[PDB]
Amino acid sequence: GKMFFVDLSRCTACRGCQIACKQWKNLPAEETRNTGSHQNPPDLSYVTLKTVRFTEKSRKGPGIDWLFFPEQCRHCVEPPCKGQADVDLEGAVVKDETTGAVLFTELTAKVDGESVRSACPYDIPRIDPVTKRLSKCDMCNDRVQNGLLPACVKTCPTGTMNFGDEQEMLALAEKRLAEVKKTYPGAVLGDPNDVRVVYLFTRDPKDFYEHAVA
């Protein structure tokens, strides 16, 4: 089915992807404050399916390694969120067999949410404490099925975001890895055989975020 290749060597942390996701879905805004960082909202939530994490790491000589990470559901080929959810109720987490989208339904309200989240290696699912429904990135499956790019892929100015067939995007990922590896020797693809959102990290993925890789 489909795959994203996310080239973090070209991210400007413009947060176009963050805004594009909310515009397409018409998601409400969280109430945020500055706690000493550009990062906001601080975390994924029921109404934030993608936020850009900002981490400052050191390098030799002038400046810093500024690591940007637009976090989203990885759309796992064999998703543990679905395994866990199916114990309580099937239909709460379904797979689109054409796109590869892992999709949450209203039926997540009737499963143990803390368990679905705890089942996720990348710690992605968020619960509405009011309604008990779970939310995450739905791969803009709606748009994809009508042949369009996800909102966040269409909006990206830089070539960080790429989307299409699994075969194309793995080939692009390996090509871009070899090229980027010259500028950045610690660069790696994130769990490329297990997910449909393959990130190119410019150094140790953990530096980007605790749950960047499984």
Binding site: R10, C11, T12, A13, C14, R15, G16, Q18, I19, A20, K22, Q23, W24, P28, A29, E30, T32, R33, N34, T35, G36, S37, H38, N40, P41, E56, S58, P62, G63, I64, D65, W66, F68, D142, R143, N146, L148, L149, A151, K154, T155, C156, P157, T158, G159, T183
Partner: protein, 973 residues
């Protein structure tokens, strides 16, 4: 199909934010009769290819915002509350105020008995946010009312760029365009944070890098731009001339300049007079008492025939190039490093990297903006880089040029339409009092007796005459020229500019102000002065999208509504996607956009507001008469109208211009009514009208060339991304300016792989040639009097060569280059204190932007998604400063200058580090200026509380990029 977009009509627009000019697709409900349901990028637009930064991507939420103004509001003198009123009430009462105020302050003759026909007691601010047709129209309306105090964003933005690049190249505009960045071999970003401030531009910057380019960011801070660059060097704020002058020395000293290019295409050969000297920070001709230069001392030595003398061997001691080497020999890495804070190692690496584009088959571009412009030495910052591009043969070539990045979507276009005190549309100077007649006006225009020097400005009489025929087509140009208002020849131009307007306003000398699509209570430097000064107005007409700090200054912080007698009319306009028109991007690309939704509630397009407002003024002058009512009565507003609404189309056609009678021009036959095909076909005799001569070509008999959406290119056009058939750029679709410098004597490209033009079969192919004529037969800089790229630029107020001067508020008390600490002719106001190496304000202040917010934040502080990402004012400080002041990351701090004080949350980061300046650590405090007291709660107020009302002697731009502050921990709550 998609549920969201299914019964909605698709239309195209262009982004209402930055000058990149990104393409938008807009979906409007009930196939056009309802509200916008979606806004995203246009996948077919050649610049953004469907990309949007978060400002563009949240336009939907701007358009469909419930905090938007619904209808006109009235604030009575000493009132603490708004009264909803009708458009009929608001616009009739404003006309009465306009008329009353004009009658009481209209000066026919000045002190000296010269004719001026001007209103002294009304000023207008704005706007680069309005369409090109509304900008042109607004300026003609204001001038028909006899206003001279006409300003907008441009004054406090790129005002230095215009005289800087015009002195250097003849034009003041961005020399290439956005797609051309992909052709560069070295992109120097400096005075610019383009990944944040021109995001879609980084698409082309990173494509340059994909194909071998080196990316260099030189900035006081490590930014989102720095992270995606190959080389990052720090530089202290207001220390850019040292850096650039160091690079000039390095280029010359190592013979890395392009010899042939420099010899033939620049003024390197020209001989400078014996009167020109420089001694310890002063050029020849300094009047110490008037704080003014006698530019006569800087003239070229002329041959008998009027032409400046040349030594092609570059041997004569008073050759421009030999005087250049002499000037910048003092800029050695040791002295530049001590004053910039930039290490010798790092200077050497940036210089080596950028200087290598000296080769003919290489192109280095500079991307610069507010980091260079917003200084007392703003203009000289830009000259210095303009000089570097000429030494390296980078002007005219693909992947080269001076990319002065324009800010607002139509600031280029609003400057084009002469919404500044000193210019009419088409950059014709506003006439001064000594210009008693149209002949004396045109007699100022310099002339050349060099056969190769095109000196295209010689055609001015045609443009000035066609413009006056655009306003007043039933009157002789000689007669119409007496209707338009004049400035005093005695006074400095800066007496008519932004900063002095607020000084005058604060002494009670203004009764009326149009804040039209601007927010000067947040955008104007020294906001406290501005907020007090607006209190001294009789009336204020604020036209904007939302209630704001300008509209409601009377209930702002430390304000008692009951003490303030200002009458305020708030008039709500439409957003960009609710109206049709054109906007001029940084590339001069004049792009046409379409109506999506109908105007929200009872909001009105700017054009419709100003036309209706003017119709009430004229109608009132017919009834009861008053001061000199001719220019009002006779102004051609018939051609601005169709179906009893403003017609952007008809105005665009008038701005292009057409024939008033059948005539014969340039060896061709034209029939009355036909559109003027180009500015070459305009006439001084009164047979052609044209609102703006740069627009001559934009709307022909062929049709609206601004609305062309054709990606078709020749193979040589496609190789450098020219997209000649996508919209239209001025002048006459020349996508890369000065492209005649991109070929040798015979017309062969310097860089054949990336050719702009080329002589092939008795024609230029590629880009429209900038200056007609066979190879070798003309000088390639056609807008220059002498036709050459100016290394020596004798028209500039502080001298013909950039020299280092410390900012008006600086951390040092001694300039290591001279005895002249400050710019010797700096624009200052009497008795405004400056903090210079003062222990009470020991820290460098600067102000700058983030990706998520636009300008003062009037617009984006209303967009919940942009507030979500950047909720409050922050203060960026180093780890070392935070240690010294006991400030932790996330702590509240107080930033203070001599002018004001504000609270912000501290961001402690290695992205800022001390500057080692003369063996002493100097700390910098950085603030965004996107915040104001009205929205959101806990957001904070403008950094412009801190910024000084002093700046560039040429243009009156304030020094918002380098001043002095303290920062202190706040212990409250």
């Amino acid at each position: 199909e998609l549920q969201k977009l299914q019964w909605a009509k698709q239309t195209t627009s262009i982004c209402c934010y930055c000058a990149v000019g990104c393409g938008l697709i807009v979906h409007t409900a009930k196939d056009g009769q309802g509200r916008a349901v979606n806004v995203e990028g246009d996948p077919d637009h050649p610049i953004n290819e469907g990309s949007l930064c978060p400002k563009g991507a949240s336009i939907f939420q701007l358009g469909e915002n419930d905090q938007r103004g619904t209808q006109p509001l009235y604030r009575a003198p000493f009132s603490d509350t708004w009264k909803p009123v009708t458009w009929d009430f608001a616009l009739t009462e404003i006309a009465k105020r306009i008329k009353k105020t004009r009658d009481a302050s209209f000066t026919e003759k000045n002190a000296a008995g010269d004719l001026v026909n001007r209103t002294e007691a009304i000023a207008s601010f704005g706007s680069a946010a309005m369409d090109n047709e509304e900008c042109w129209a607004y300026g003609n309306i204001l001038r028909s009312l006899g206003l001279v105090y006409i300003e907008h964003q441009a004054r406090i933005x790129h005002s230095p760029t215009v005289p800087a690049l015009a002195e250097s190249f003849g034009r003041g505009a961005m020399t290439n365009h956005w797609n051309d960045l992909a052709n560069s071999d070295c992109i120097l970003i400096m005075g610019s944070n383009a990944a944040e401030n021109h995001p879609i531009a980084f698409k082309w910057v990173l494509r340059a890098k994909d194909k071998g380019a080196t990316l260099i960011h030189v900035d006081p801070r490590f930014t989102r731009t720095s992270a995606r660059c190959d080389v990052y060097a720090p530089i202290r704020s207001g220390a850019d001339i040292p850096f650039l002058g160091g690079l000039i020395k390095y280029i010359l000293d190592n013979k890395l300049y392009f010899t042939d290019y420099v010899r033939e295409y620049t003024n390197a050969s020209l001989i400078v007079g014996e009167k020109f000297s420089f001694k310890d920070g002063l050029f020849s001709g300094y009047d110490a008492a008037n704080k003014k230069y006698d530019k006569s001392m800087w003239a070229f030595e002329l041959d008998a025939n009027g032409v400046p003398k040349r030594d092609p061997a570059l041997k004569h001691p008073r050759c421009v190039i030999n005087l250049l080497k002499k000037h910048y020999e003092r800029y050695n890495l040791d002295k530049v490093a001590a004053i910039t804070g930039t290490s010798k190692e790092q200077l050497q690496q940036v210089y080596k990297a950028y200087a290598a584009t000296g080769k003919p088959d290489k192109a280095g571009t500079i991307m610069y903006a507010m980091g260079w412009t917003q200084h007392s030495v703003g203009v000289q910052n830009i000259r210095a880089m303009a000089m570097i591009q000429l030494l390296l043969g980078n002007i005219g070539v693909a992947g080269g040029g001076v990319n002065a990045l324009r800010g607002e979507s139509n600031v280029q276009g609003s400057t084009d339409q002469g919404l500044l005190a000193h210019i009419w549309p088409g950059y014709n100077p506003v006439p001064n009092s000594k210009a008693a007649t149209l002949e004396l006006y045109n007699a100022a225009t310099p002339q050349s007796k060099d056969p190769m020097s095109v000196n295209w400005w010689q055609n001015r009489p045609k443009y000035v005459a066609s413009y006056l025929k655009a306003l007043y087509p039933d009157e002789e140009p000689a007669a119409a020229y007496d209707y338009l208002p004049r400035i005093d020849a005695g006074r400095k131009l800066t007496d008519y500019f932004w900063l002095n307007i607020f000084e005058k306003m604060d002494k009670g000398e203004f009764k009326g102000l149009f804040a039209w699509g601007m927010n000067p209570a947040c955008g104007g430097a020294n906001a406290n002065k501005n907020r007090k000064a607006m209190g001294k107005l009789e009336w204020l007409v604020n036209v904007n999208l939302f209630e704001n700090e300008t509209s409601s200054f009377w209930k702002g912080p430390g304000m008692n509504p009951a003490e303030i007698g200002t009458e305020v009319f708030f008039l709500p306009c439409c957003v960009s996607i609710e109206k049709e028109g054109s906007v001029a991007n940084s590339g001069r690309w004049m792009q046409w956009r379409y109506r999506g939704p109908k105007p929200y509630a009872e909001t009105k397009p700017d054009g419709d507001i100003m036309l209706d407002m003017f119709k009430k003024v004229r109608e009132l002058y017919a009834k009861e008469g008053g001061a000199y009512p001719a220019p009002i009565a006779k102004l051609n507003i018939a051609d601005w109208e169709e179906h009893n609404e403003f017609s952007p189309t008809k105005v665009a056609k008038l701005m292009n211009g057409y024939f008033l009678k059948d005539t014969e021009v340039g060896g061709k036959q034209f029939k009355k009514g036909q559109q003027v095909p180009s500015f070459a076909f305009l006439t001084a005799d009164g047979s052609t009208c044209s609102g703006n001569w740069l627009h001559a070509g934009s709307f022909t008999d062929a049709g609206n060339l601004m609305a062309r959406r054709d990606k078709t290119q020749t193979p040589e056009q496609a190789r450098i991304g020219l997209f000649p058939n996508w919209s239209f750029c001025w002048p006459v679709n020349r996508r890369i300016l000065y492209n005649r410098a991109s070929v040798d004597k015979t017309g062969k490209p310097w860089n054949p792989a990336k050719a702009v033009i080329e002589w092939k079969d008795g024609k230029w192919v590629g880009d429209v040639v900038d200056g007609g004529g066979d190879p070798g037969t003309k000088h390639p800089f056609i807008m220059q009097t002498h036709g050459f790229g100016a290394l020596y630029g004798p028209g500039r107020e502080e001298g013909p060569f950039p020299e280092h001067y410390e900012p008006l508020e600086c951390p040092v008390s001694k300039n290591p280059f001279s005895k002249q600490l400050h710019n010797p002719v700096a624009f200052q106001i009497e008795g405004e204190k400056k903090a210079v190496a003062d222990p009470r304000y020991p820290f460098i202040g600067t102000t700058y932007r983030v990706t998520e917010h636009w300008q003062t934040g009037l617009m984006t502080r209303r967009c919940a998604w942009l507030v979500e990402a950047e909720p409050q004012i922050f203060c960026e400080i180093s780890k070392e400063l935070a240690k010294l002041r006991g400030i932790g990351n996330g702590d509240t701090v107080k930033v203070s200058s001599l002018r004001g004080a504000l609270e912000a949350v501290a961001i402690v980061t290695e992205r800022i580090r001390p500057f080692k300046i003369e063996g002493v650590d100097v700390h910098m405090v950085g603030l965004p200026w996107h915040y104001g007291w009205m929205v959101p709660k806990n957001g904070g107020d403008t950094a412009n509380l801190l910024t000084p009302s002093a700046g560039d002697p040429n243009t009156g731009i304030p020094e918002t990029k380098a001043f002095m502050v303290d920062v202190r921990k706040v212990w409250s709550h």
